[PDB]
Amino acid sequence: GASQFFKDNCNRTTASLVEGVELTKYISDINNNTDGMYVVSSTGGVWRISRAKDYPDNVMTAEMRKIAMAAVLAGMRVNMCASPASSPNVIWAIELEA
Amino acid sequence: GASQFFKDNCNRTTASLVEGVELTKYISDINNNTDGMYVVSSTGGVWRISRAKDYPDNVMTAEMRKIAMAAVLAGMRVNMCASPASSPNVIWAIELEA
Amino acid sequence: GASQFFKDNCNRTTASLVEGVELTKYISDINNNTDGMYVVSSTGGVWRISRAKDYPDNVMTAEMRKIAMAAVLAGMRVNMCASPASSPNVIWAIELEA
Amino acid sequence: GASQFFKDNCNRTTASLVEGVELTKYISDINNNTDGMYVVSSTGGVWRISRAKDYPDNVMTAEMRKIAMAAVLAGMRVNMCASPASSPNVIWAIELEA
Amino acid sequence: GASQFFKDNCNRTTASLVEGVELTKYISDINNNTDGMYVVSSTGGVWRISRAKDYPDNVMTAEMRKIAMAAVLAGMRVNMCASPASSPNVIWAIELEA
């Protein structure tokens, strides 16, 4: 379950906490209409990972993509802070667990 | 099989949906006229990975390369949206599946 | 147990040595005020990974992220030299132990 | 067995095909006059991995280094298109086999 | 044991060959005056990994970090060509062994 720290930081925002998601697909598409990379859960939910060219968000967004690939490869769960103002909902923070 | 999201995205393009491919070889080639990154399926189908010079597309092509190499290492399947305009067909989108 | 080298180096500083920590969650956040990379231990303790825009510190901070991810994926323990000046405490050095 | 695609491509070149190589060592060296990245096979043969500073070859040579490492860590075989011009022979294409 | 090629190259330098080293710790430090990347062996021996900003040594030194980290995670041995002129001794070449 989400760390107290992660839930606290989500509840400072207007986003929604989604806990224990099992990501089973990870998508890279070159279409110019994308807003980043996408992950799909075992129940068919889709979320987007944002992109940023410069420091510092170029670090966090890369580590979001590393978390997604490690969660899909190993069957690890994640918790998400996801904003419903975009569709697919955009990930503002992600926690990989165990 | 392809998420609905990935299927819908491929249908907005001229490229073809190829589902459930088992990639078994990953090629890097710097020779004249054949330079590129390619993947080979267990039955001998060949595709070229997209390439891109600049941000944002070079983030997307880096993640395709990571997806294709992870699929080959782990024996995981991928779904592809691949363009028939050249041969080998060029992967415009890829979905790693667990 | 922390190498004597790592302990000697942390003894030069105002930070504190934390030994044998089991990291169980890895967080990337781009929210507006809590952005950063963090790790959470099995007891719920939280640390922020150092960030640096330029060479050479951006080499070491990238390896701190790689160490934190590998520790969470593998259940490998780490030793930290962590500054109590902020909450979460900032990791200024980390040792991955096999 | 190398894919026919990889054999056909190598056969366009002045390089030679080496199939089914088991790489057991991976070397990085920054000493004068020996600097480079190299691989050594189970029988003791040595190859240099190509290098390139610029796009697009900087992509393919980085993938060559990822393939080499993965082959050595997992005991996977590779097929190589290697130029006999210099010693060690330089890898111009490589195919990782699962 | 070290390849003949690795040994021949190290014998050309002022550095020492160290064979069969079992690395068990990997350190990243950004503290003043002790900053750097380091590895520690099962005996307590400590080495500094070379670093470089510019091409081409930025490639080799990144691969040295990847070799160190892989050796620690998987308990693989390395061979090193390490200079005694500094403490910790600096790694000028490294060979990962399967």
From Swiss-Prot, chains A, B, C, D, E:
Gene Ontology MF, one: toxin activity
Keyword Amino-acid biosynthesis: no
Key words, A-Z: Disulfide bond, Enterotoxin, Signal, Toxin, Virulence
Top-level taxon of the source organism: Bacteria
GO cellular component: extracellular region; host cell membrane
Disulfide bonding pattern of the chain: C10-C81
Biological function: The biological activity of the toxin is produced by the A chain, which activates intracellular adenyl cyclase.
Subunit annotation: Heterohexamer of one A chain and of five B chains.
Protein name in the entry: Heat-labile enterotoxin IIB, B chain
Species assigned in the record: Escherichia coli
Source organism phylogeny: Bacteria, Pseudomonadati, Pseudomonadota, Gammaproteobacteria, Enterobacterales
